Design a protein around this motif. Structure first.
Motif, PDB file in Angstrom:
ATOM      1  N   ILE A   1       0.962  -1.162   0.019  1.00 32.49           N
ATOM      2  CA  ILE A   1      -0.130  -0.148   0.054  1.00 32.49           C
ATOM      3  C   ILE A   1       0.924   1.220   0.160  1.00 32.49           C
ATOM      4  N   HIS A   2       1.170   1.821  -1.086  1.00 30.54           N
ATOM      5  CA  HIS A   2       1.895   3.155  -1.336  1.00 30.54           C
ATOM      6  C   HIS A   2       1.278   4.124  -0.348  1.00 30.54           C
ATOM      7  N   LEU A   3       1.980   4.409   0.738  1.00 30.33           N
ATOM      8  CA  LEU A   3       1.741   5.655   1.625  1.00 30.33           C
ATOM      9  C   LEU A   3       1.914   6.953   1.070  1.00 30.33           C
TER      10      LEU A   3
ATOM     11  N   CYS B   1      11.278   1.481   1.812  1.00 36.36           N
ATOM     12  CA  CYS B   1      11.562   2.666   1.368  1.00 36.36           C
ATOM     13  C   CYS B   1      11.832   2.095  -0.432  1.00 36.36           C
ATOM     14  N   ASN B   2      11.149   2.781  -1.370  1.00 35.52           N
ATOM     15  CA  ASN B   2      11.323   2.330  -2.574  1.00 35.52           C
ATOM     16  C   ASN B   2      12.021   3.462  -3.333  1.00 35.52           C
ATOM     17  N   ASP B   3      12.528   4.511  -2.830  1.00 38.76           N
ATOM     18  CA  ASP B   3      13.554   5.439  -3.423  1.00 38.76           C
ATOM     19  C   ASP B   3      14.793   4.592  -3.645  1.00 38.76           C
TER      20      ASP B   3
ATOM     21  N   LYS C   1      11.060   9.280   0.756  1.00 39.60           N
ATOM     22  CA  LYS C   1       9.790  10.010   0.131  1.00 39.60           C
ATOM     23  C   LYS C   1       8.885   8.753  -0.351  1.00 39.60           C
ATOM     24  N   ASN C   2       9.470   7.845  -1.189  1.00 41.14           N
ATOM     25  CA  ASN C   2       8.466   6.911  -1.546  1.00 41.14           C
ATOM     26  C   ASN C   2       8.752   5.803  -0.551  1.00 41.14           C
ATOM     27  N   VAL C   3       7.694   5.927   0.485  1.00 39.13           N
ATOM     28  CA  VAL C   3       7.622   4.986   1.611  1.00 39.13           C
ATOM     29  C   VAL C   3       6.260   3.864   1.051  1.00 39.13           C
TER      30      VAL C   3
HETATM   31  C1  LIG Z   1       7.061   4.547  -5.838  1.00 32.61           C
HETATM   32  O1  LIG Z   1       7.513   3.266  -5.621  1.00 32.61           O
HETATM   33  C2  LIG Z   1       6.794   2.351  -5.998  1.00 32.61           C
HETATM   34  C3  LIG Z   1       7.276   0.929  -5.925  1.00 32.61           C
HETATM   35  O2  LIG Z   1       7.544   0.444  -7.168  1.00 32.61           O
HETATM   36  C4  LIG Z   1       6.181   2.785  -7.504  1.00 32.61           C
HETATM   37  O3  LIG Z   1       4.668   3.189  -7.591  1.00 32.61           O
HETATM   38  C5  LIG Z   1       7.156   4.020  -7.978  1.00 32.61           C
HETATM   39  O4  LIG Z   1       8.526   3.479  -8.378  1.00 32.61           O
HETATM   40  C6  LIG Z   1       7.062   5.310  -7.141  1.00 32.61           C
HETATM   41  N1  LIG Z   1       5.931   5.846  -7.281  1.00 32.61           N
HETATM   42  C7  LIG Z   1       5.826   7.177  -8.010  1.00 32.61           C
HETATM   43  C8  LIG Z   1       4.448   7.818  -7.847  1.00 32.61           C
HETATM   44  O5  LIG Z   1       6.762   7.543  -8.510  1.00 32.61           O
END
Ligand SMILES: *[C@@H]1O[C@H](CO)[C@@H](O)[C@H](O)[C@H]1NC(C)=O
Ligand SMILES: C[C@@H]1CN(C(=O)N2C[C@H](CN)C[C@H](C(=O)Nc3ccc(Cl)c(F)c3)C2)C[C@H](C)N1C
Ligand SMILES: *[C@@H]1O[C@H](CO)[C@@H](O)[C@H](O)[C@H]1NC(C)=O
Ligand SMILES: *[C@@H]1O[C@H](CO)[C@@H](O)[C@H](O)[C@H]1NC(C)=O
Ligand SMILES: *[C@@H]1O[C@H](CO)[C@@H](O)[C@H](O)[C@H]1NC(C)=O
Ligand SMILES: *[C@@H]1O[C@H](CO)[C@@H](O)[C@H](O)[C@H]1NC(C)=O
Ligand SMILES: *[C@@H]1O[C@H](CO)[C@@H](O)[C@H](O)[C@H]1NC(C)=O
Ligand SMILES: *[C@@H]1O[C@H](CO)[C@@H](O)[C@H](O)[C@H]1NC(C)=O
Ligand SMILES: *[C@@H]1O[C@H](CO)[C@@H](O)[C@H](O)[C@H]1NC(C)=O
Ligand SMILES: *[C@@H]1O[C@H](CO)[C@@H](O)[C@H](O)[C@H]1NC(C)=O
Ligand SMILES: *[C@@H]1O[C@H](CO)[C@@H](O)[C@H](O)[C@H]1NC(C)=O
Ligand SMILES: [Cl-]
Length: 341
Positions: free
Chosen positions: A42-44, A113-115, A125-127
């Motif tokens: 669930i992207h926060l 963390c997906n950064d 910031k991409n949690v």
């Molecule tokens: C944040 O990481 C997620 C995981 O893959 C993915 O939606 C994307 O790489 C990033 N989201 C945005 C909106 O950049």
């Protein structure tokens, strides 16, 4: 929403095949649960979480996990820990790490963390929230990190404080340099590791560039370590149960910033080995008759920097390791444990 920085007892999952004698398989068959057959994330939305990979209880839980795993699996003929001589049996076993997932109980969750720039400390910031980490192989090794995940973009250096010397430096590579280690079948302890020199020297030049980026574009120099036991001073690892000690002097010393060729590294299959789970000597039986071969991916580097280089023009880095916590902390960096307050 809402969460607090708290840690709780974790559980593990794996695809351990039952009725397989792989010691990793048979440890995850009795100590881990079958993998989540439908997990989800669930992207926060709009988040800024502060993971501090250098201080994190996930890695320590994983640590004792591998301590136990290895304790009941790789068992030495003789063990000399403190003031005691443990004699026991040492049948040669089956050994090849398998992925282990870590998984929160109800009430807690894992913050991933997906950064892709993430260095370990500092906000992200991409949690992105998951109940289980991903599949992680628990590879035990010094100097070179093997069979792991790679940086999604640039080469990233991770540290608990770059400035501080003792605080280890971890290097997360963005591409895989394969290493190919062998003991030819009928001296039986003589082994070797092929590593293609163009690959290694190119990526090493990419590292050395980024290294410079973090350090005020000072002179970059990669030398062999300054004393220690074989474990520290030699790329040590376990292949099929055997402990390979490989003398990586070439890589941190050939300094071919065009060299070319397929480098061939010397190695010794050690029996008496200083342990990593704790202070002590473990003596195993001689190797098995046959072609002992493992081809692994170099996916990281354990570096330590020389101290009194303040008032000079260079900064010397020597491969290190020995603390396998750092090995785990090289894959769990993008993970945090949150209590739902
Ligand atoms: C944040 O990481 C997620 C995981 O893959 C993915 O939606 C994307 O790489 C990033 N989201 C945005 C909106 O950049
Ligand atoms: C409580 C201490 C105990 N301990 C330790 O004493 N040593 C010293 C010994 C040399 N003196 C090398 C140890 C090591 O790395 N061993 C090792 C063995 C097999 C393989 Cl395959 C491998 F890759 C590595 C590290 C481990 C340390 C993290 N810990 C903090
Ligand atoms: C890691 O990233 C944070 C935030 O971007 C920064 O403050 C910190 O200096 C970085 N540390 C290293 C070792 O690069
Ligand atoms: C890896 O990162 C370095 C930055 O140090 C960059 O120059 C190089 O192109 C990257 N290579 C890949 C395959 O991502
Ligand atoms: C002296 O050395 C430390 C590294 O141990 C370094 O971080 C510090 O910046 C140096 N002192 C000055 C004044 O730069
Ligand atoms: C980082 O290391 C330097 C070198 O000793 C030290 O002066 C500084 O306080 C350290 N930073 C933190 C946040 O502990
Ligand atoms: C080694 O790296 C390559 C490319 O990075 C990847 O396709 C392969 O799956 C890796 N091998 C292992 C055993 O992880
Ligand atoms: C690894 O080395 C062995 C012995 O030199 C060789 O037979 C094998 O083809 C090599 N494989 C790779 C992928 O390098
Ligand atoms: C590794 O080999 C080099 C020769 O290439 C030698 O000078 C060095 O002492 C060796 N290191 C160890 C730890 O045996
Ligand atoms: C490794 O570095 C040492 C100096 O520490 C040097 O004597 C030796 O020639 C170097 N080995 C190679 C293969 O360049
Ligand atoms: C790395 O993975 C490959 C493929 O699974 C395996 O053959 C090799 O033994 C592994 N290396 C180590 C050090 O576990
Ligand atoms: Cl589950």
């Amino acid at each position: 929403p809402v969460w607090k920085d708290a840690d709780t007892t974790l559980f593990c999952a794996s695809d351990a095949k039952a009725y397989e004698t792989e010691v990793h398989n048979v440890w995850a068959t009795h100590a881990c649960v079958p993998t989540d057959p439908n997990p989800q994330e669930i992207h926060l939305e709009n988040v800024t979480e502060n993971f501090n990979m250098w201080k994190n209880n996930m890695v320590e839980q994983m640590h004792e996990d591998i301590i136990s795993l290895w304790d009941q699996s790789l068992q030495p003929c003789v063990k000399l820990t403190g003031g005691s001589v443990i004699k026991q049996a040492c049948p040669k076993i089956s050994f090849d790490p398998i992925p282990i997932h870590y998984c929160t109980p109800a009430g807690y969750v894992i913050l991933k963390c997906n950064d892709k720039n993430f260095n370990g400390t500092g906000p992200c910031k991409n949690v992105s929230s998951v109940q289980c980490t991903h599949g992680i192989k628990p590879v035990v090794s010094t100097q070179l990190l093997l069979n792991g995940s790679l940086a999604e973009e640039e080469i990233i250096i991770r540290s608990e404080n770059l400035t501080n010397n003792a605080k280890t430096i971890i290097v997360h590579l963005n591409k895989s340099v394969e290493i190919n280690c062998t003991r030819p079948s009928n001296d039986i302890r003589k082994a070797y590791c092929e590593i293609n020199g163009t690959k290694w020297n190119k990526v090493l030049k990419q590292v050395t560039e980024k290294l410079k980026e973090h350090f005020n574009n000072k002179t970059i120099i990669f030398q062999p370590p300054s004393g220690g036991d074989l474990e520290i001073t030699m790329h040590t690892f376990n292949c099929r149960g055997e402990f390979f000690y490989c003398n990586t002097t070439q890589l941190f010393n050939n300094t071919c910033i065009g060299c070319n060729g397929t480098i061939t590294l010397p190695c010794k299959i050690k029996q008496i080995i200083n342990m990593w789970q704790g202070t002590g000597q473990a003596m195993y039986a001689p190797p098995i008759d046959g072609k002992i071969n493992c081809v692994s991916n170099i996916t990281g580097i354990l570096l330590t920097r020389d101290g009194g280089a303040n008032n000079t023009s260079n900064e010397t880095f020597r491969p290190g390791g020995g603390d396998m916590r750092d090995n785990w902390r090289s894959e769990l960096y993008k993970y945090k444990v949150v209590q739902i307050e």
